[PDB]
Design a protein around this ligand. Structure first.
Ligand SMILES: Cc1cc2nc3c(=O)[nH]c(=O)nc-3n(C[C@H](O)[C@H](O)[C@H](O)COP(=O)(O)OP(=O)(O)OC[C@H]3O[C@@H](n4cnc5c(N)ncnc54)[C@H](O)[C@@H]3O)c2cc1C
Ligand SMILES: Cc1cc2nc3c(=O)[nH]c(=O)nc-3n(C[C@H](O)[C@H](O)[C@H](O)COP(=O)(O)OP(=O)(O)OC[C@H]3O[C@@H](n4cnc5c(N)ncnc54)[C@H](O)[C@@H]3O)c2cc1C
Lengths: 536, 535
């Protein structure tokens, strides 16, 4: 049998809708599927107070850089969620892409049918569509707590992954006047929520096990003159972000930390720290993430600034990580976060030394005290992937989740052996963790378009990585990872298995190779007739 | 005073015409100047028999890849000069670029007017045109001192100016009944020699020392293949934009010394028989970094020459002993070695017996006299294309004097002393080992972006700072020094001892990978052209 569609794209975040647009544009039959009511992905689902980009708006706005909505005007240097959603909606208007999508629809299963070289996609556990190619754009991140009696709390509970919204689409109940509020989690979302909650809360208790390194965002409104000169510079901006390791508008200093004196370093860090955006991390010395000494130079500088900004030295010290290097995790940026602790009604609770024994009807119970609360905010982190919710079955009925149980195994981060004609766009296993996804995801969608077109042009109906290509690729991805500070720092990012026979397999959950070098490899493969893929 | 033009572009080869096209398309006023009649540059001036690409036609044809002439059809895998000239003509037609050019016109001088931030450009030592920006696209290569050349009574042919018929094809390529001498076995000689031998009564090749050459493996391009190529143009473009040379090849990730002798030989045998430059560009990653690895390949190619040339004494005179393989841009050949197997073809070693003079009757060497009906001077390449122009910067300094110790630039594009002046496509910015169809196109795009940024911001002055130029120029020498090229081509380095006794070394050749170099250029452009003072 022949499939009804050339492709199904799962997801209508920035990645999915661009893939669908490209495929329709090339004259092929695409159906998008989205669980929500409309486009946006991240920017549709996440509506908690202070939700905002870490990437310069202009750099994230690939659809404007690529001339799809070249006239777009950013109002802020780092756009809030509502502005981001307007951006994605405007892009979708211009792409005329909503008409290819079925919204309010979940893919629950997808099954490869060997004899027909197609995928059977089950929607909402009932209807089945068939496509030659299945393309996942289901999100590089998933909702992340492990404490008794959470459901027993009799006040208002808020979860940042599913913040309640009103009729407009704005967050519900962010006015905390008269309320004692407890926040669990000081990761990226916690450091955005904490300062805002503190504006109105009667009291605010922050339950922190271990701190993250955070740096100031430096956000400000975008003037008309800046926005115009940016747009005039788009051709250079595009070429620049295509050429940096992360696709952020930053590149590392060519010197090592020791190439300069303590005096120069301090002045260098001071200047970076006060500059809006990720410069402090991404413009740092070349060995920042390769050398413990070099990393300590910066980590000690950031500590110094945290002690400057927090008045109480006891509290200051609890906000400074002693257990991991700076820049081992996508660093959260913040707007007046550390200053929040200077408020009379803000209290830091160290739950490492006094762990939470249970959430109770009245609040939170640690080993050391009872906190009577009206509100608990679960400012919960991020990893388990977006694909696990789908029962994906490849050849011989193998489950993707079993295929990847000892860690992701792919060729080029895009296809897995066992699962022909299936592309996995934008995920930690192909570089989303440290990427400007706006740009990285766009370029990846373009590469997938070119492979599908090549197959169409050549009459190929089957693609699957060989065992050798997959194994070498995955080993090489791990080898890249292991040469950095991330490997010792993030233990859970490496799956180590000892096989029956006795071989030891090491795989990283997170691909950290530079984008340009990654894409150069992908073009080497594409030009040489998709070497490493069995095509038929 | 305000300049009449935003820019003057010197030259109508593929680089110049593209630059001029870009600037006019951006809505700026450009004037092109070209010494010749029409467009083509290389492909206009070089009309000798056997002239042909070393780069796969589809990969050189950036104008087809970029959608300027997307419908173009290559008739062979490595296009002959006549096909290339048609390519450039068709591109120029589609670009509507000839209307912006002065032809039959030679820039003789260019002077920077400091009070006015513009260039005065002198044409054929008479008319003066003014521009904000001067962009040289005068060619990555320029241009024999033998007593008595004018004394020969036979026919003399110079490869750089082969006479043409009315249809513009080489004249006098039938040597039936003629005794022919060819002086030189660089790129042009090895293209001319096998063709001359098809008809010559007798052929004498006057060779000082041999080059390394490899088989081109050229063949006609079928419609089927052309169409499949056109369909993958998006991929082909991305690939050539990401390889080190912009050729459609990338190095093997392994070091030569890491692969066994039997494997290596087999690897080399397959590449040797594959059309184009794979034997060099797809080779081991350390070919130009490790002497033992290079020697593996040089020994292999020598084994192939001994196989192809029947007489071992002649074969050995055709195998270089003085240099590593691939330390110069390697001439590719069509049946060149086999020419020497013919009974009427003779290799004359002029190292062993240098030429004394040309005489009315032929050539006299230290050893013998050769009676000839035809002499072909198949000349090679040194001096730069800019040397022919009297270029004066601030305080009336000559560019010749500013670059006397070697080229000194920022980003290979502008030189301190010479504001608003861009040098496109020359050995000092990567042309030697590049597919110039692509590298040059990309360079022109970068310069256009800089010029557009200046126009947007109202800047009328650009010049590299001393620190930027020095740092850049020193790095370029550093990368160069860590390759075999430093030992192999000693004349590619200028070593000056200054009056204070300090030693300055500059490379004449920039050898960084294209992608890396362009990344550096974008780092600069994004950061408001840091290292250029702009005003
Ligand atoms: C708060 C926050 C801030 C961020 N800030 C940045 C930033 O500044 N810079 C940056 O580069 N990245 C940032 N990101 C990362 C973000 O993931 C990417 O920028 C980008 O939004 C991901 O786009 P996407 O289309 O790949 O996936 P998503 O935006 O996650 O969209 C995936 C879509 O798939 C749908 N879906 C999933 N499964 C199914 C199914 N089974 N059936 C039907 N539909 C399904 C979901 O409903 C969702 O709409 C941020 C993420 C978060 C959460
Ligand atoms: C025989 C041969 C084969 C080659 N094969 C390849 C190949 O296969 N692949 C590859 O990448 N490269 C090859 N090259 C290199 C070649 O130089 C480039 O490919 C390319 O043609 C250079 O283009 P250009 O526009 O930069 O300069 P050119 O083509 O050299 O043109 C420069 C133009 O400037 C004009 N000019 C110079 N000075 C003045 C002046 N003062 N006033 C007015 N006009 C002036 C000249 O008349 C000329 O027309 C080859 C070169 C030669 C000689």
């Amino acid at each position: 049998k022949s499939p009804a569609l050339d492709a199904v794209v799962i997801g209508a975040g920035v990645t999915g809708i661009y893939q669908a647009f490209l495929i329709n544009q090339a004259g092929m039959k695409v159906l998008g599927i989205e669980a929500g009511e409309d486009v946006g992905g991240t920017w549709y689902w996440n509506r908690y107070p202070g939700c905002r980009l870490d990437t310069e708006s202009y750099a994230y706005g690939y659809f404007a850089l690529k001339g799809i909505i070249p006239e777009w005007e950013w109002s802020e240097n780092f756009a809030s969620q509502p502005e981001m959603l307007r951006y994605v909606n405007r892009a979708a208007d211009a792409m005329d892409v909503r008409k290819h999508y079925r919204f309010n629809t979940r893919v629950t299963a997808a099954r490869y049918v060997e004899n027909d070289r197609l995928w059977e996609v089950t929607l909402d556990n009932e209807e089945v569509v068939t496509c030659r190619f299945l393309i996942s754009a289901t999100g590089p991140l998933s909702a992340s707590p492990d404490i008794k009696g959470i459901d027993s709390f009799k006040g208002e509970s808020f979860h940042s992954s599913r913040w309640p919204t009103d009729a407009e689409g704005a967050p519900k109940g962010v006015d905390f006047t008269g309320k004692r509020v407890g926040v669990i989690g000081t990761g990226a979302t916690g450091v955005q929520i904490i300062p805002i909650a503190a504006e109105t809360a009667k009291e605010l208790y922050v339950f922190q096990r271990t701190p993250n390194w955070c740096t100031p965002l430096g956000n400000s409104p975008m003037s008309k003159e800046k926005m115009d000169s940016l747009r005039n510079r788009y051709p250079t901006i595009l070429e620049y972000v295509k050429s940096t390791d992360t696709a952020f508008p930053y590149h590392r200093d060519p010197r090592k930390g020791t190439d300069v004196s303590e005096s120069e370093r301090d002045a260098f860090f001071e200047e970076l720290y006060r500059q809006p955006g990720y410069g402090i991390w991404l413009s740092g010395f070349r060995d920042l993430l390769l050398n413990k000494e070099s990393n300590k130079f910066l980590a000690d500088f950031v500590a110094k600034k945290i002690r400057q900004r927090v008045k109480d030295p006891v509290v200051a010290e609890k906000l400074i990580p002693k257990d991991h290097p700076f820049g081992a995790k996508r660093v959260p940026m913040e707007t007046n976060y550390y200053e929040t602790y200077n408020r009379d009604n803000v209290h830091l609770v160290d739950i490492r030394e006094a762990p939470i024994q249970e959430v109770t009807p009245e609040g939170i119970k640690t080993a050391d005290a009872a906190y009577d609360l009206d509100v608990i905010i679960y400012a919960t982190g991020f990893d388990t992937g977006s694909l696990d919710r789908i029962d994906i079955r490849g050849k011989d009925n193998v489950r993707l989740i079993d295929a990847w149980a000892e860690g992701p195994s792919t060729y080029l981060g895009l296809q897995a052996r066992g699962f022909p004609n299936f592309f996995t766009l934008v995920g930690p296993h192909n570089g989303s963790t440290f990427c400007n996804v706006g740009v990285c995801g766009g370029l990846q969608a373009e590469w997938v378009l070119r492979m599908i077109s090549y197959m169409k042009d050549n009459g190929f109906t089957y693609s699957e990585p060989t065992q050798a290509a997959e194994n070498r690729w995955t080993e090489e991805v791990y080898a890249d990872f292991s040469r950095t500070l991330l490997a010792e720092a993030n233990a859970w990012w490496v799956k180590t298995t000892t096989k029956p026979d006795g071989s030891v397999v090491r795989r990283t959950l997170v691909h950290v190779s530079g984008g340009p070098e990654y894409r150069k490899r992908c073009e080497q493969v594409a030009y040489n007739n998709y070497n490493g893929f069995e095509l038929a």
